[PDB]
Amino acid sequence: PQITLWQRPLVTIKIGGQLKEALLDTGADDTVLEEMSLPGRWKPKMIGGIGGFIKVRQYDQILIEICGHKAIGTVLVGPTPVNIIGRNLLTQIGCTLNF
Amino acid sequence: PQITLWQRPLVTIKIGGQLKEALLDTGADDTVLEEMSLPGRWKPKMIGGIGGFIKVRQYDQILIEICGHKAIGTVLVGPTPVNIIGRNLLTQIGCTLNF
C-alpha cells in the first residue's frame, strides 16, 4: 500500500501468534514492542529516545507479519508507550518514503 | 525524492535562517528540534516519548524548508536527542510511506 501521513501510520502485525497494532516509524532504528510474551531466549539492552532511556529484552530472529508481509529480525521488548516498527523491519517489507 | 530506509532518513532543513539536519520521522506527530534560537512568542508544553517526557517550547506558524520544500507549522524546541520532522510537516511536503 501507499500510506499518507494525515493520521498515524498504524498497521496490524502478527507476532508470537498474537495480533497487535504498531506504528510504522521511520525515526526508529529498531523495532520496540510493549511488554508481551515471546518464545525465545533474550539479551538485556538499553535504548534511548526522547525523554531518556528504557531497559528492553532483545530477541533476535523473531518472525513478524506486518500487514501480511513477513519479516524476520530483532525485536526489542519493553516499556515503550507505543508499539513501533523500526527501520530494521521496514527495509524487509520494502517500505520507502516518497515526496 | 524517493528515500529507502537502510540508513536513517536525514535531510537538511533551513529554519530560522539556520541550516540543520533532521530525521524524517513518521512515528512523530509533531516536529521537535534541539535547542536553537527561534524568532518569536512561544508556549510551554510537555511531550512524551520512549523514556518519558521532555519540556519544550511550542512555536506556531514557523517556516521550515525541508529538502527545498517549504512548510509552515508548529515546531517544538527542547532537549530532544535528535532533530525530528513529524507528520505535522511531512503532510505539507507531500511525504508518503510506500510498500
Ligand SMILES: CC(C)CN(C[C@@H](O)[C@H](Cc1ccccc1)NC(=O)O[C@H]1CO[C@H]2OCC[C@H]21)S(=O)(=O)c1ccc(C(N)=O)cc1
Ligand atoms: C526520537 C526518535 C529518534 C526515536 N524514537 C522513534 C520515534 O518515532 C518516536 C516513536 C514513539 C515513541 C513514544 C510514543 C509514541 C511514538 N516518536 C516520538 O518520540 O515522537 C514524539 C514527538 O512526537 C510525538 O508523537 C509521538 C510521541 C511524540 S524512539 O525513541 O521511540 C526509539 C529509540 C531508539 C530505538 C532503537 N534503539 O532502536 C527505537 C525507537
